[PDB]
């Protein structure tokens, strides 16, 4: 009845819900490419039944009060590290960025409330995304922010949330989805791992996010992670409106080399990369000819430090999409670290996907304890190595 972190531990587990879903079995190897089941031509019109005393409510995130209720649900009940020491603390303005990209739909912001008190106790979301998977491009959704209030857990409310968002996506004619999780489910198309780059090692060690390496003093740890005060790449500057087309061009061409990627329109590129303070940072390299040849980006996602008397929060930057054509990726990411340090971040996180393994050890990242499993719903295809995953979710 409890989740699994490893593929061998998950293989002895029973998946009463996921056995009912159009996903491959954990045990079988996938030899084909295509949908698990044909598209449905008649879709259930009625919402799935919730347990007595709870009701569906679609959340208007343009209402400041409602957005704050969602902030609070996530702030108090969303994903923790496996030791229950830190919890994601997505900000209201970040949530609006992640949940209202181009094509967002109100019915896909799927809340659960207590009938009597109106308290928000559950959420799940879908946003539309065009996804390139091996040799197929298809319209899908990305599922994120699945959250059940701690007091409502282990009562089969999450399967109801999954079925209800599935139904609402089916009604719009979409039959595939992509999603990620730290737990093992049937069946990962790719397995990634977070790595962490200390920026403020003293704070990270004090709050036990990080620990002193074997036979290393704090003084040595400070010198080890020390960074230059300014970046080194010539012509590095924040992305501006005039850069939207070339950033779209660079990204589109760069992503062709991977096997699971988004296909963004120019409007989606504007949404996902145009800088917004405390949400998304994008820096381009404009060379001596005035041409933009590279860019780096990272998003802002702090965590709550639970039950700590002094340090309440950790400011974390997450590597987003980094595109190099003239500047070495190593130099780009070195400058990303310098920029994050300048902007007050305590740690810089990056997955081992795309080409990130080429710089992780060199730039003094340390391996994390969390896997990031990538999944497709209703799509059969062979799994891929982390290096071929070219998709980053919020």
């Amino acid at each position: 009845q409890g989740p699994a972190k490893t593929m061998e531990e998950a293989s002895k587990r029973s998946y009463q819900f996921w056995d009912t879903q159009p996903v491959p079995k954990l045990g079988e190897v996938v030899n084909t490419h295509g949908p698990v089941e044909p598209d449905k031509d008649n879709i259930r019109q009625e919402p799935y039944t919730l347990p007595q005393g709870f009701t569906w409510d679609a959340l208007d995130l343009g209402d400041r009060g409602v957005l704050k209720e969602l902030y609070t649900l996530l702030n108090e009940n969303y994903v923790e590290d496996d030791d229950n020491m830190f919890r994601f603390d997505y900000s209201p303005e970040f949530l609006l960025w992640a949940l209202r990209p181009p094509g967002w739909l109100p019915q896909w912001h799927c809340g659960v409330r207590v009938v009597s008190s109106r308290k928000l106790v559950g959420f799940i979301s879908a946003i539309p995304a065009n996804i390139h998977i091996y040799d197929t491009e298809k319209k899908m959704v990305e599922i994120n922010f699945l959250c059940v209030h701690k007091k409502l857990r282990s009562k089969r409310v999450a399967p109801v949330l999954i079925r209800e968002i599935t139904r609402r996506v089916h009604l719009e004619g979409i039959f595939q989805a992509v999603y990620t999780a730290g737990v093992v489910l049937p069946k990962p198309v790719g397995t990634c791992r977070y790595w962490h780059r200390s920026l403020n090692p003293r704070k990270l060690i004090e709050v036990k996010f990080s620990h002193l390496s074997r036979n290393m003093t704090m003084q040595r740890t400070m010198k080890l992670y020390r960074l230059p005060e300014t970046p080194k790449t010539a012509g590095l500057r924040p992305m501006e409106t005039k850069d939207i087309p070339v950033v779209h061009q660079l990204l589109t061409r760069y992503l062709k080399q991977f096997h699971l990627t988004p296909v963004m329109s120019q409007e989606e590129v504007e949404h996902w990369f145009y800088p917004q303070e405390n949400i998304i940072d994008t820096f381009v390299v404009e060379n001596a000819n005035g041409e933009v040849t590279d860019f780096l980006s990272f998003y802002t996602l702090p965590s709550t430090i639970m039950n700590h008397p002094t340090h309440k929060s950790l400011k974390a930057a997450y590597s987003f999409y980094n595109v190099h054509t003239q500047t070495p990726l190593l130099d780009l990411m070195s400058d990303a670290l310098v920029l994050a340090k300048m902007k007050g971040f305590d740690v810089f996180n990056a997955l081992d996907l795309m080409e990130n393994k080429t710089f992780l050890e060199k730039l003094k990242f340390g391996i994390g304890d969390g896997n990031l499993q990538y999944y497709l719903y209703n799509w059969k295809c062979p799994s891929m190595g982390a290096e071929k995953v070219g998709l980053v979710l919020q």
Binding site: V79, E80, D81, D82, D83, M85, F86, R87, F88, N144, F145, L146, Y179, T180, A181, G182, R193, Y194, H196, F209, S210, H211, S303, N349, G366, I367, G368, D369, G370, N371, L372, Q373, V392, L393, Q394
Partner: peptide
């Protein structure tokens, strides 16, 4: 992506 990691 619904996975909270910290260094091993």
């Amino acid at each position: 992506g619904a996975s909270f990691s910290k260094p091993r």
